[model samples]
Target chain A: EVPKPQEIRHILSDYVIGQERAKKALAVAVYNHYKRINSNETKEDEVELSKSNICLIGPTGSGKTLLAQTLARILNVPFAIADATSLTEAGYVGEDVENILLKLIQSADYDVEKAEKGIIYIDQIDKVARKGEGVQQALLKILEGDTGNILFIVGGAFDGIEQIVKNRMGEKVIGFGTDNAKLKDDETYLSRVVPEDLLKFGLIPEFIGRLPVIATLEQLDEAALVSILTEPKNALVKQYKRMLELDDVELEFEPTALIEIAKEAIERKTGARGLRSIIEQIMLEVMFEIPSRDDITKCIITEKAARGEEEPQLQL
Target chain B: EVPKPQEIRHILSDYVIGQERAKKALAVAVYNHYKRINSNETKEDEVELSKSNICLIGPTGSGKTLLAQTLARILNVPFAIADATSLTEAGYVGEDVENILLKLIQSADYDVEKAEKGIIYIDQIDKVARKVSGEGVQQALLKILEGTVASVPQIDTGNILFIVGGAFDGIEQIVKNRMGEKVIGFGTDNAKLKDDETYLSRVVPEDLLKFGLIPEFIGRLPVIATLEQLDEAALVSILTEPKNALVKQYKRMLELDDVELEFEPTALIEIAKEAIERKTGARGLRSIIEQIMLEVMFEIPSRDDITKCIITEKAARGEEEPQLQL
Candidate 1:
């Protein structure tokens, strides 16, 4: 029996935050993709079971890579996370196309045949723009399929293409003096990112043509961001507390502190990526300064301390 | 003899568009820098001559690179561009600090003495600030900028024109932080001044001090120019008005394969429209145009029959290929 997408989405919700639309898109694609493969072997469908390729787009640190990694975990699949920008860096010691496969092979225990059907998450697919047609052709070969069922999950920052999303929605374009970035964000903008838009952004139409499953992850709002810090399976706060538990100590974060963390992350505009840095800044000193005193059994992070307004103190 | 700031400004005007404040600020800095150099060498002025390295703040693709590159061209001196983000990437390798000077020396035709005077544009210098407490890259940069400290460094940056820049989006958070509490009433309830946007366009030097750039680093960059976030009009001008505008570049590339590209005004508006949608500012135009032209570029080169390609509003929106004259 084919697993319902709702069930898969529920599994994804445990670890990921603020990209329900993208989760649903990935859920359905994985549901169909696996069913297609299984049905072909068992002849259960007795119908066409073509692959549903995926194109995941969003800003850096918006959890595009996290989504794919989380889904791969949920599905229990061998996958590789590769960023296009990083792949092209280090002076092209090898072709990026072969490198993507090389990671797949590594994940598949060096089995070429087994690697063929695995997932390869190519980040910053938009980075290929102006890197020239030679590079685009290499990516196209993967997108066009026939690499023996390898599912290419591609993502890009596609930075600066948001105005068209607002244009299509008929919101203000200019002179209200709005931030081009802060304008028209949230789920609606993600919804507004359609297949045609990617074509306009420079992925060859033929490449987009193969990947029918397209998901644009939502930009994180403070509320969604707070959830990222506190609600995920191993939310930063939970992880910090759990580590303290080993020493028979408790780590507690004030509501204000969490809000401060989220605010700083949002301000940094590094998306989910900023959360780690902010958390590190708040915790590094406490981790080092406390724990030696016998009277102190709890670590308390106040809003002021987290914002670097005051010193973080350990409570006895 | 010092070149007139107006002449320097005029030279920049040919290549850069819509950044009058940045161009003017850079022109003045260049003029003063050169005059000071000349005076010190000729022993005419007992006074000091020092370079006021520029700090450019704007969103990506709003001609930050263009302004620096064009200015360097007019100076007709050796120049090198190194993004500060990549410098911080994976932490500073020993080679990283060396490369900044190595390029300067190479660009100066391996003349170590002349490399001291070349400009090294450090793109996205803001990335190094949050690391705090003199991290490897941070210490390396402070050392490089100090130039004299390295003794015989990879490239002498003692007098090198180091114009460091980045989108510095976090700087807005500083403004928002200052204004949010005083102004953010609606958010906890039903409204928010989000008044920071207006304040953002008016940020002063003290405000940048809040982004964690140690006062020592901030003190080095004097003539700071914060660019107004690009709107539709500036974006449209970016496509057609610059000396190496996107439309011209695209046309030039297509012409190589015997296809002449002509962009309709509406088409240009539409192209800017998508870039605006991507929200990456000036950096997005290339992506929108590349995506729109990917197929046309791929297909046109294969055929010798095509003559002229007029890109239209629909074509710009990626609705269809430009109607080709075969």
Candidate 2:
């Protein structure tokens, strides 16, 4: 039971904070793939339909993995993630490409029929994108779904691709004016990436060919990161509050503390992914000693606590 | 007597909806212009600050004229609008460029000092930008704008602020050539409209130069303000939010006959969508409302039983006649 593109994106907003363009692209890709599988006309008509694998390029913690995982949950399909950094060529010192299929099978509880129709997300593909055509060849068959019609989604931070796009944008055109336009911010330029830009980033032409659908996620600003901390259905703040609520501990975060945490994450350049560890380290002392004292019923996180200046508040 | 830049923009928002960039640009330009004239340093220092003329490029009824008129009102200065389509070279059949200064003088009640400090808005400036004696009209107008002396009015124009406006409809291709993308992305039709405005917002001075405004003219108008095409929400606000909105005017007129007038939110939305569909911008909303209210007004005076009328979506689309209520 696959949802339509807009319906899938609507469900995604409950979990993810932003990246509407990437969400639309992923929604349409998954909707079409499942519709292709469910169509009776595929047998009636002589024209065969092929799967279009997607490649997500964005900064770290811009919700690449979160988008893929949420999509699998919404579709209720078995999903597995394999890091491209750990894979290598045949007879090489790394995990074989067939292990990617084994993961799908194991995730589907060893049912080959269900595993064959599942989704596989490959992280850090940009690592192997550079200096490894052998690895690209080894994974080509699996991505093509020679074993089964499995959907492949490859994603990476793709460090420095922004410069590649910037260079393309700044190149002199054949016209008589100055530069087409001054280079915009990374978010604007990343959306304008062409196929040639990927070739310039050293993803071989063949590997680039496998992933025809490209969606770019924008860099998270402080506003978006703050939204991620408090807005999602399973937000970091909500999760912490639920964990502390079990021990009858009432938790409160000052508004300024939320802003400070977002600013701190921006400084770390780790995006939304680093919000958890920062909140955890600040809450470590209170969490460790709170259970020993039965009268401690309230805790408040302040701006200084968010920046690691003062300890979290505890009161009876 | 001069309001701050943001204050001027705040007052502009009361009368004009949308076009935030143009509003801000006009505010800053007018504020800086008056500050330069009132400064004590002009008499003390050797450096003389030249007036920076403004050019407003936008589609029809996108609040270009409204912004200029609102600025003049806020500053309480003498203002006059002259059509460039009527002005020509000194030896030509049309009105001479000197008559342009005459309108400003007449608006100031022949007070030469006040007229010199007033604002002159030249509408349809794109008309004088074509070939032949159009170039001559441009040269003749350039001298008057550059603070040269005019004969009949004896006005210096050294302190006068000139604001020129035109639609310049097909300038998108010039922007597209520079940006190097045919269509930015493939998405819903709403996304396409968003992308089109992105090109308009990215407009530079070079694009205007290519649009046939001579280089020297563009140099004088150093600050360029662009107004966006009014979308449905802006048109709806124009219908209901302004000080003299169409809906309010109708309600006041109905009150004279001891009757009440009401328009549902769905009716407002339908009227705005029709204006957008007709491509008439904010100006079109009034005419559409006028059509729907004509019969309602006629029936109100003849009957005493009906004391209220509500305009619904069906009435807005002209699908059914609006009904009177008791």
Candidate 3:
């Protein structure tokens, strides 16, 4: 009924960058969900396998939402992106949990059967903890029970949970020598995440029980950000090239400029999400002046231009 | 501080069957490298010891890559496998040699320091010896082999051990020619090299150069471990001797269903002989066992009364039905 886990991940990689850990988890989770429902075996006293809902913990623009969206597109299922921050108690002044199902149903053209088999991505799940007691109870049923067939992937930044993990690990080391070097090991705390860490991060035990597969994404470094800009199927650089091609102007971005752009984005600490904003700021004058002149047949963005120290290399 | 060569070989024997010669070679080479890295003994008279990167020459499924993987697992170090066939010279269409360390770094969970101390197993190295571009691939690997700062985040390969393996099929003829059996010489002797199978064991670095590997590449990998072609007895041992043997795995599987799986001695021998006939080495054992137990594994979980599934030789040869005990 579904493609293999590796095949799903292969499709995910065409659009997403560098969260292979998360991509694999989601791929296996979704692949098994399709298997669980498609099998014709009896569910009688036998050990019936339950659904493994996924929870993604990573910083913003780490491809948490992008992975879910890409998976849903690949499956062609009726997927709903529901914000956990907007969801509250049914009696309160906010949308109820059932509204998410309605959105799924609406996406499925009022077919409840198709909607029941769809996926839901609950964003900003960490925000649910602030005033989340009621919302957590509301989401409990959807994650399990009636909508058992539906796969839910909840994701959040969970910014400072590394400290929680460090506290639990006792912050002790074998020796001062190794500890100093080990402290610089990125993804050390996140990769070692257990359900206990998420429990301490404020997800109710019942809620955590519903979502058994916890996947953490790494923070996008300069290399990943650089690849994200130019390597994806619909990459930023390709999109700009296609946009400029219609105006009969060839666009050339030097390899050095891409590195400079990635380095600048790293300084902003906004991950891959900030690259477009940085590019937009640099391209403002060029995009405006390009169409106004017919003599400019080629435009090259160099390291100096990317840093705003010089203009784009315009050629007649 | 590291395990002795014999101890490492003993540990390897628990998981891998046969290939005792290759195991000792790998164990000794790995132990010496571990000592070379860990020992702090400084002496003015002592010459600096260079890392002896290893090369494994074996037929397919002779536990060449498996031996390297098991050693890394036993030592609990970061290990990454790269296929030499997929590599090309820099600026070409295929992956660069630096990408191998990139994978090594990822396997260490982005810990560059730990990665620098990891093991890299490059497989299908024989594939690169003959191609025009493949020779270029070997040249590209020189920098990484001699230990230099390469790859993103700059991992140093000086301490990273490289173990490259390949089938290197049909090298026996080269060894035969080098042995120089004179047709009419008074001192000519063929009695010493009676076994053609023993030719692979007699392989030297010079023979590899004749087989297409460059002199520089062969010089870097000073340790050569050649795995013998597994025979029927070796294949039978492979099924039941290893700590994670195929029979133990199937036993554990059927045991979960409250059933015990037993294999008659002839059945194991038949399976091993069939694997030899298929010419697939130890890997064929798994496929053969999978076919023999497919229906049993599928049907056992559904029933409660059948407590034993005895596989006789006839069943292994697909000649008779399995004998089940209630």
Candidate closest to the true structure, highest lDDT = 3
Please write out the lDDT profile of model 2 over residues A1-316, one tens digit for every residue. Answer: 5665667778998988888867776776666566656542144212223354677877888877787778878888888887767664322322245666677888888876567568878888777766434455544434422353677788877776757755654455566434655534455557645445676777644455456466777678987887888899858878887777777775786657778888888999888878888888777765776667465554545555555644576565
**Mind giving the per-residue lDDT tens digits that candidate 3 earns over A1-316?**
6676666778888989778867766775675566555552113322224355777778777777677778878987788888867664322312345677778888778776566668888888888765224456545434433366787888888866767755643356556444444342335557545454666776654455456566778777877887888998757888877787777776787767888888888888887788888777777756787677575554545655456544577777
- For candidate 2, what is the DockQ-based docking class? incorrect
Off by over 4 Å in 1: A1-316, B41-47, B86-95, B112-116, B131-136, B149-158, B184-198, B298-316, B324-326
lDDT tens readout by residue for model 3, B1-326 = 66788988888887678878878887777676666555521235545566678888877657665677687877788887765544454454344467777777777898755565578887656645652635666776776787764544365565566688777775767755765555444686655555677778778777777677788888888888888778988887888877657677556544544557788788888887766755655644654554454345334434454554445555345434466775
Maximum-TM-score candidate: 1
Taken over the whole model, the C-alpha lDDT of each candidate is 0.61, 0.65, 0.67
Superposed on the true interface residues, model 2 gives a C-alpha RMSD in angstroms of 29.2
Ten residues in sequence with the least summed lDDT for candidate 3 chain B = B39-48
DockQ values per model: 0.02, 0.00, 0.01
Q: What is the lDDT of residue A155 in candidate 1?
A: 72
lDDT by residue (B277-325, candidate 1, tens digit) is: 5565564565456445544544543555565454654544454666667
Cα deviation in Å at residue B294, candidate 3? 2.7
**For candidate 2, lDDT tens digit of each residue in B3-79?**
68898899888778988887888777667666665561254463666667788777765766667767677777778
